[PDB]
Scaffold this active site. Structure first.
Site, PDB file in Angstrom:
ATOM      1  N   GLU A 293      19.019 -29.255  78.864  1.00 62.47           N
ATOM      2  CA  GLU A 293      18.108 -29.719  77.820  1.00 62.47           C
ATOM      3  C   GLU A 293      18.064 -31.251  77.759  1.00 62.47           C
ATOM      4  O   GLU A 293      16.966 -31.819  77.656  1.00 62.47           O
ATOM      5  CB  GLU A 293      18.484 -29.118  76.449  1.00 62.47           C
ATOM      6  CG  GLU A 293      17.421 -29.383  75.384  1.00 62.47           C
ATOM      7  CD  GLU A 293      17.693 -28.635  74.091  1.00 62.47           C
ATOM      8  OE1 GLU A 293      17.426 -29.212  73.014  1.00 62.47           O
ATOM      9  OE2 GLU A 293      18.163 -27.472  74.153  1.00 62.47           O
TER      10      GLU A 293
ATOM     11  N   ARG B 242      11.049 -26.207  74.939  1.00 64.90           N
ATOM     12  CA  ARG B 242      11.742 -27.467  75.230  1.00 64.90           C
ATOM     13  C   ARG B 242      11.016 -28.254  76.322  1.00 64.90           C
ATOM     14  O   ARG B 242      11.630 -28.829  77.224  1.00 64.90           O
ATOM     15  CB  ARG B 242      13.199 -27.220  75.620  1.00 64.90           C
ATOM     16  CG  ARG B 242      14.056 -26.611  74.514  1.00 64.90           C
ATOM     17  CD  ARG B 242      14.122 -27.477  73.270  1.00 64.90           C
ATOM     18  NE  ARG B 242      15.154 -26.977  72.371  1.00 64.90           N
ATOM     19  CZ  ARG B 242      14.971 -25.987  71.497  1.00 64.90           C
ATOM     20  NH1 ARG B 242      13.788 -25.391  71.394  1.00 64.90           N
ATOM     21  NH2 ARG B 242      15.977 -25.579  70.736  1.00 64.90           N
TER      22      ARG B 242
ATOM     23  N   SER C 224      22.835 -28.598  72.247  1.00 67.84           N
ATOM     24  CA  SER C 224      22.937 -27.582  73.284  1.00 67.84           C
ATOM     25  C   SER C 224      22.575 -28.188  74.636  1.00 67.84           C
ATOM     26  O   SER C 224      21.522 -28.816  74.790  1.00 67.84           O
ATOM     27  CB  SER C 224      22.019 -26.406  72.970  1.00 67.84           C
ATOM     28  OG  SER C 224      21.591 -25.787  74.173  1.00 67.84           O
TER      29      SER C 224
HETATM   30  C1  FAD Z   1      24.173 -32.450  67.291  1.00 63.90           C
HETATM   31  C2  FAD Z   1      22.834 -32.425  68.028  1.00 63.90           C
HETATM   32  C3  FAD Z   1      22.102 -31.311  67.620  1.00 63.90           C
HETATM   33  C4  FAD Z   1      20.843 -31.102  68.177  1.00 63.90           C
HETATM   34  N1  FAD Z   1      20.055 -29.917  67.764  1.00 63.90           N
HETATM   35  C5  FAD Z   1      18.741 -29.691  68.339  1.00 63.90           C
HETATM   36  C6  FAD Z   1      17.927 -28.498  67.900  1.00 63.90           C
HETATM   37  O1  FAD Z   1      18.347 -27.732  67.108  1.00 63.90           O
HETATM   38  N2  FAD Z   1      16.617 -28.290  68.497  1.00 63.90           N
HETATM   39  C7  FAD Z   1      16.082 -29.248  69.517  1.00 63.90           C
HETATM   40  O2  FAD Z   1      15.023 -29.088  70.010  1.00 63.90           O
HETATM   41  N3  FAD Z   1      16.894 -30.401  69.908  1.00 63.90           N
HETATM   42  C8  FAD Z   1      18.215 -30.610  69.325  1.00 63.90           C
HETATM   43  N4  FAD Z   1      18.970 -31.766  69.739  1.00 63.90           N
HETATM   44  C9  FAD Z   1      18.410 -32.680  70.787  1.00 63.90           C
HETATM   45  C10 FAD Z   1      17.712 -33.909  70.178  1.00 63.90           C
HETATM   46  O3  FAD Z   1      18.151 -34.067  68.891  1.00 63.90           O
HETATM   47  C11 FAD Z   1      16.201 -33.663  70.230  1.00 63.90           C
HETATM   48  O4  FAD Z   1      15.878 -33.406  71.565  1.00 63.90           O
HETATM   49  C12 FAD Z   1      15.492 -34.914  69.656  1.00 63.90           C
HETATM   50  O5  FAD Z   1      14.127 -34.713  69.659  1.00 63.90           O
HETATM   51  C13 FAD Z   1      15.794 -36.166  70.500  1.00 63.90           C
HETATM   52  O6  FAD Z   1      15.228 -37.258  69.815  1.00 63.90           O
HETATM   53  P1  FAD Z   1      15.797 -38.763  70.121  1.00 63.90           P
HETATM   54  O7  FAD Z   1      15.066 -39.795  69.275  1.00 63.90           O
HETATM   55  O8  FAD Z   1      17.297 -38.871  69.926  1.00 63.90           O
HETATM   56  O9  FAD Z   1      15.339 -38.901  71.717  1.00 63.90           O
HETATM   57  P2  FAD Z   1      16.220 -39.717  72.846  1.00 63.90           P
HETATM   58  O10 FAD Z   1      17.499 -38.956  73.076  1.00 63.90           O
HETATM   59  O11 FAD Z   1      16.401 -41.085  72.296  1.00 63.90           O
HETATM   60  O12 FAD Z   1      15.163 -39.578  74.052  1.00 63.90           O
HETATM   61  C14 FAD Z   1      15.071 -38.315  74.664  1.00 63.90           C
HETATM   62  C15 FAD Z   1      13.897 -38.410  75.675  1.00 63.90           C
HETATM   63  O13 FAD Z   1      12.767 -38.687  75.060  1.00 63.90           O
HETATM   64  C16 FAD Z   1      12.216 -40.107  75.553  1.00 63.90           C
HETATM   65  N5  FAD Z   1      11.627 -40.738  74.394  1.00 63.90           N
HETATM   66  C17 FAD Z   1      12.242 -41.018  73.248  1.00 63.90           C
HETATM   67  N6  FAD Z   1      11.350 -41.587  72.409  1.00 63.90           N
HETATM   68  C18 FAD Z   1      10.172 -41.656  73.048  1.00 63.90           C
HETATM   69  C19 FAD Z   1       8.926 -42.152  72.641  1.00 63.90           C
HETATM   70  N7  FAD Z   1       8.404 -42.757  71.431  1.00 63.90           N
HETATM   71  N8  FAD Z   1       7.899 -42.094  73.464  1.00 63.90           N
HETATM   72  C20 FAD Z   1       8.062 -41.571  74.713  1.00 63.90           C
HETATM   73  N9  FAD Z   1       9.290 -41.098  75.113  1.00 63.90           N
HETATM   74  C21 FAD Z   1      10.338 -41.136  74.275  1.00 63.90           C
HETATM   75  C22 FAD Z   1      13.298 -40.716  76.006  1.00 63.90           C
HETATM   76  O14 FAD Z   1      12.891 -41.639  77.086  1.00 63.90           O
HETATM   77  C23 FAD Z   1      14.155 -39.614  76.623  1.00 63.90           C
HETATM   78  O15 FAD Z   1      13.641 -39.255  77.821  1.00 63.90           O
HETATM   79  C24 FAD Z   1      20.320 -31.991  69.148  1.00 63.90           C
HETATM   80  C25 FAD Z   1      21.055 -33.093  69.547  1.00 63.90           C
HETATM   81  C26 FAD Z   1      22.310 -33.304  68.995  1.00 63.90           C
HETATM   82  C27 FAD Z   1      23.201 -34.482  69.350  1.00 63.90           C
HETATM   83  O1  0IM Z   2      17.520 -21.887  67.961  1.00 65.42           O
HETATM   84  C1  0IM Z   2      18.166 -22.130  66.901  1.00 65.42           C
HETATM   85  O2  0IM Z   2      17.810 -21.599  65.819  1.00 65.42           O
HETATM   86  C2  0IM Z   2      19.386 -23.057  66.910  1.00 65.42           C
HETATM   87  C3  0IM Z   2      20.290 -23.265  65.842  1.00 65.42           C
HETATM   88  N1  0IM Z   2      21.184 -24.123  66.255  1.00 65.42           N
HETATM   89  N2  0IM Z   2      20.930 -24.496  67.510  1.00 65.42           N
HETATM   90  C4  0IM Z   2      21.755 -25.432  68.256  1.00 65.42           C
HETATM   91  C5  0IM Z   2      21.493 -26.794  68.229  1.00 65.42           C
HETATM   92  C6  0IM Z   2      22.305 -27.658  68.941  1.00 65.42           C
HETATM   93  C7  0IM Z   2      23.371 -27.156  69.670  1.00 65.42           C
HETATM   94  C8  0IM Z   2      23.633 -25.800  69.710  1.00 65.42           C
HETATM   95  C9  0IM Z   2      22.821 -24.938  68.996  1.00 65.42           C
HETATM   96  C10 0IM Z   2      19.858 -23.885  67.965  1.00 65.42           C
HETATM   97  C11 0IM Z   2      19.238 -24.039  69.366  1.00 65.42           C
HETATM   98  F1  0IM Z   2      19.404 -25.313  69.837  1.00 65.42           F
HETATM   99  F2  0IM Z   2      19.823 -23.165  70.243  1.00 65.42           F
HETATM  100  F3  0IM Z   2      17.897 -23.776  69.303  1.00 65.42           F
END
Ligand code: FAD
Ligand code: 0IM
Length: 337
Positions: free
Chosen positions: A333, A164, A237
């Site tokens: 996160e 992450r 998460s």
């Molecule tokens: C229901 C839910 C489930 C999720 N499950 C996961 C999962 O399983 N695994 C995981 O890793 N994450 C998960 N996430 C977190 C999120 O989806 C990821 O971190 C995703 O990559 C965020 O993308 P975004 O476009 O929404 O970024 P934003 O939330 O819009 O931005 C996040 C950060 O990135 C910056 N940023 C965004 N775009 C750019 C760009 N082009 N260039 C430079 N900086 C930028 C922003 O300034 C900010 O700091 C989940 C979120 C939710 C709500």
């Molecule tokens: O590792 C995985 O396989 C997995 C599967 N679901 N989610 C998860 C994603 C968003 C909120 C809670 C859980 C994960 C992670 F984010 F913990 F990474």
């Protein structure tokens, strides 16, 4: 640019926080990006980059130019038979991009099915689920250097990916990711560790699953298990799984036999942060408009009307409580603004 002044960011973040941005702009290619940067510097406003706002905790009105990343484009760059180099613009929605690749016979992204957000944001927190991380398929990206508006290519090494984490999260506000290139495959043996995904595929009578089969299972499990921000605001998460050295690990293990951990290849144990939170008694906790999900103990939630400060304060209480009980600091996160 669809420029708007003093605009609510509520539809732009999955937590559903309602704070206003001094200036909201939507970028639909690099020119729009360069224009917004000129605009921010012209108005003396900082620039906040937003994708799907699904990894964002907004805590106050945003005195900045908020740039919504909405550029479009997905393409095969080169086909090498067993591998395929594909490219997508930063504003491409992640999960429709996964499906686009799977419809094309390409494997590599199926374990990252249904993650919200944009292609542009995916390298920033090295998105990962079901034992796969973006860095596993990452070839390169093009980023705009926000110091001098030049364009730079980052290969996988230059991105310094981590759990992450990435160069871009370490050097925040420095790089504006414009498009991302990934190496996907064909005909690879699907490697699936024991678990619910493998179990469901066996139940479907599928011992050599295609990437599409794996993706269908993982979508089903995520839709069954994870709160939808559409109904209940959240950013997935909230905390990362913390690592401890062998010293703290053996002490925590002596205090709790049921300790859910993961032994790492470097000798440390990554603790299951949801277990720390659950065993803290936090699962299902509510305080007004914020709470912890009753089953996914990692998912802090906005039941409706919450401020980001209320979310941050709840996160801080859990952090402090887990610090005080287990001697372990839970890192967040989401990115807090
Ligand atoms: C229901 C839910 C489930 C999720 N499950 C996961 C999962 O399983 N695994 C995981 O890793 N994450 C998960 N996430 C977190 C999120 O989806 C990821 O971190 C995703 O990559 C965020 O993308 P975004 O476009 O929404 O970024 P934003 O939330 O819009 O931005 C996040 C950060 O990135 C910056 N940023 C965004 N775009 C750019 C760009 N082009 N260039 C430079 N900086 C930028 C922003 O300034 C900010 O700091 C989940 C979120 C939710 C709500
Ligand atoms: O590792 C995985 O396989 C997995 C599967 N679901 N989610 C998860 C994603 C968003 C909120 C809670 C859980 C994960 C992670 F984010 F913990 F990474």
């Amino acid at each position: 640019l669809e420029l708007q002044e003093h605009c609510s960011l509520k539809p732009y973040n999955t937590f559903g926080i309602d704070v206003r941005a001094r200036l909201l702009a939507h970028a639909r290619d690099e020119a729009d990006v360069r224009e917004a940067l000129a605009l921010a510097r012209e108005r003396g406003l900082p620039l906040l980059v937003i994708g799907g706002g699904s990894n964002l905790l907004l805590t106050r009105d945003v005195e900045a130019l908020v740039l919504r990343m909405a550029s479009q484009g997905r393409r095969i760059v080169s086909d090498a038979a067993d591998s395929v180099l594909v490219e997508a613009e930063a504003g491409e929605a992640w999960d429709p991009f996964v499906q686009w690749s799977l419809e094309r016979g390409l494997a590599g992204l199926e374990n990252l099915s249904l993650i919200p957000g944009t292609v542009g944001a995916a390298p920033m927190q090295n998105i990962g689920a079901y034992g796969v991380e973006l860095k596993d398929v990452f070839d390169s990206l093009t980023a705009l250097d926000r110091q001098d508006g030049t364009l730079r290519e980052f290969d996988r090494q230059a991105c310094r990916f981590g759990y992450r984490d990435s160069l871009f999260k370490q050097e925040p506000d420095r790089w504006l990711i414009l498009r991302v290139r990934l190496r996907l495959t064909r005909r690879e043996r699907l490697h699936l560790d024991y678990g619910p995904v493998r179990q469901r595929l066996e139940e479907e009578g599928i011992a050599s699953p295609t990437a599409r089969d794996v993706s269908r299972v993982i979508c089903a499990i995520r839709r069954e298990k994870l709160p939808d921000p559409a109904v209940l605001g959240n950013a997935g998460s909230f905390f990362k799984n913390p690592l401890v050295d062998a010293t703290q690990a053996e002490r925590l293990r002596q205090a709790f036999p049921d300790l859910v951990g993961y032994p790492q290849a470097d000798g440390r144990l990554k603790l299951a942060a949801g277990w720390l939170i659950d065993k803290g008694g936090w699962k299902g906790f509510r305080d007004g408009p914020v709470g912890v999900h009753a089953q996914q103990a990692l998912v802090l939630v906005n039941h409706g009307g919450a401020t980001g400060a209320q979310v941050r304060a709840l996160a801080e209480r859990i952090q402090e409580d887990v610090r005080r009980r287990f001697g372990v600091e839970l890192e967040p996160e989401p990115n807090l603004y």
